[PDB]
Design an enzyme around this catalytic site. Structure first.
Site: not given
Ligand code: NAP
Ligand code: NAP
Lengths: 296, 296
Positions: A108, A183, A251
């Site tokens: 997102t 979104k 964010k």
């Molecule tokens: N969780 C929810 O319910 C949900 C639902 C819909 C959408 N989203 C959206 O989906 C996206 C991911 O969410 P999430 O819940 O999966 O987050 P998360 O658990 O914090 O995972 C983030 C991922 O991105 C990686 N990452 C972050 N910054 C990076 C960079 N600069 N370079 C390389 N890799 C990077 C992290 O790597 P590491 O493993 O190394 O930390 C991890 O694999 C976000 O934009 C969130 O807003 C989330």
């Protein structure tokens, strides 16, 4: 430089490489693997790639190394700067992609960002869709995500089998950035629904109500919501873990407010929710689930 | 002074008289009639009693005239002052009730008000339950309301058949005022869920999204809510009619804030929602549905 074969035949033109194995990404990628589309993964923290390597998935050394080996790159990283790093950094996707590769950003950010990513990618002959999702961690695990997509309609159709591996209802929203647009609309609603739950619960506790009964009543007309269904049980148990991280909602809301300002729309609730979540991050609770607002 | 027989036998001890045939009350009373419990109605505006009289229901000249003829009086009027008028005014329920009559206030007010009504009624030998409802106009029509009840547990059981005529899930919350307490908690959630929908829609319109698609996405995880399910279709059509009146929500929120102040709880979202709805009333839109916020 050509390469050895991988899990997915080249002639499919459907080899997928997945970047970002987080709360959402790991399960999404696993679903792609179950469906026969996953060839490769990249994660900044290598250890998260282990379960994939154990199933024979190629673990890439960089986004470039991944891109050279696949036809579709899906990105599920945190925020827009993170997408910029994986796509355009020194060893980013653009350094290894060949023309005709398609990038799908499922994270997102915002319509403006999606359009910028597409424009930059296009210089390299790379296609782009923004296909953010809703349904949470549970949806990702269950493969029932609702996926909302912006970009070329022809590409939406081409990639439908891939989207279907990860989600259930797949909705084409429009041109590039229209997925992020939907979104953001969704996030306004999720944020306020969450504030609603948290405030109701705070009131219920103050009033000395039986939480079993409060939960029963709230899980219906028309107080009921996705936030309640996904998170009330965790919250009642004191499990503040994500779920969906507060910093991520903060964010998202920031992007919502930027669009609202640009367009002359006043969103006082979204503004408050942004303030509340900003404070939650300031206070050190940015990695807790959004359901922990008011309880951290 | 004894009276002639009515629709419901005296020996049942279940003769119901219903006061307040509004958006909720008319359908609730009709369900009671279908179930064989309704003997009498009173409405300030006589014309609304016509469909009941056409089915043989006794139309009372006053709340007192009604009370003298029934065992249970259900009140579904607007606000607490209105309940005070029907119960304690010159020709109010207390002027005609006999000891052992039970009053059930199904309207929304507050725990403090419920306790006051019970205390006053008790002087006359009259019993009291607060049994506010959720599910909206649709629930009332469908007979599927969730009903949340405060008062003597024995009376909750005695009246279960009556509640079941009008609702589906009937929940005993606790002593007097605990029903209103749960309702107030519910209203925090409903208000904020509604603000969430309205703001998301305003953003979606600003972004030029296809409303068919916006509706599809929002009707799922986890943006989805009762407010969306009940009211988004009307709202998309420009039908601003209640539904649930804005003035009533404003009133509910005022009660929420009073409790929160008393108890030292900060509810910034509820405070904003109160402001927004207060303004809606000020602007002359108090009789529109709550879903019209932002669109009136
Ligand atoms: N969780 C929810 O319910 C949900 C639902 C819909 C959408 N989203 C959206 O989906 C996206 C991911 O969410 P999430 O819940 O999966 O987050 P998360 O658990 O914090 O995972 C983030 C991922 O991105 C990686 N990452 C972050 N910054 C990076 C960079 N600069 N370079 C390389 N890799 C990077 C992290 O790597 P590491 O493993 O190394 O930390 C991890 O694999 C976000 O934009 C969130 O807003 C989330
Ligand atoms: N609508 C919803 O979705 C909903 C859902 C749950 C709970 N509630 C709550 O239920 C209650 C009733 O809501 P509603 O939607 O039915 O309202 P409504 O349509 O405005 O009906 C109000 C009823 O109360 C009567 N009334 C009001 N003040 C009175 C007074 N001083 N003396 C005598 N009768 C009086 C009105 O009589 P007239 O016919 O003469 O005007 C009408 O019958 C409210 O407390 C509301 O907050 C509403």
């Amino acid at each position: 430089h050509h390469h050895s074969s991988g899990l997915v035949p080249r002639g499919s033109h459907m080899r997928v490489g997945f970047i970002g194995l987080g709360i959402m990404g790991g399960p999404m990628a696993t679903h792609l693997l179950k469906a026969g589309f996953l060839a490769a993964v990249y994660n900044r923290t290598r250890e998260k790639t282990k379960p994939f390597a154990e199933a024979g998935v190629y673990v890439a050394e960089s986004p470039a190394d991944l891109a050279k080996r696949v036809d579709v790159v899906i990105v599920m990283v945190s925020d827009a700067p993170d997408v910029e790093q994986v796509l355009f950094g020194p060893s980013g996707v653009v350094e290894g992609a060949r023309p005709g590769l398609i990038v799908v950003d499922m994270s997102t950010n915002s319509p403006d960002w999606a359009r910028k990513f597409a424009e930059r990618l296009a210089q390299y002959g790379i296609e782009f869709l923004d296909a953010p999702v809703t349904g949470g961690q549970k949806g990702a695990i269950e493969g029932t995500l609702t996926i909302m997509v912006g970009g070329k309609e022809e590409l939406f159709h081409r990639l439908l089998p891939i989207f279907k591996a990860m989600g259930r209802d797949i909705v084409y929203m429009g041109p590039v950035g229209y997925g992020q647009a939907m979104k953001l609309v969704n996030q306004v609603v999720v944020a306020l629904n969450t504030v609603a739950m948290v405030e109701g619960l705070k009131l219920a506790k103050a009033l000395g109500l039986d939480m079993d009964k409060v939960a029963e009543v709230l899980t219906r007309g028309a107080a009921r919501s996705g936030a309640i269904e996904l998170y009330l049980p965790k919250l009642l148990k004191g499990d503040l873990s994500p779920g969906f991280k507060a910093e991520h909602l903060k964010k998202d809301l920031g992007y919502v407010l930027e669009e609202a300002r640009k367009r002359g729309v006043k969103l006082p609730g979204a503004e408050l929710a942004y303030e509340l979540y900003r404070k939650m991050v300031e206070d050190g609770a940015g990695s807790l689930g959004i359901h922990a607002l008011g309880f951290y």
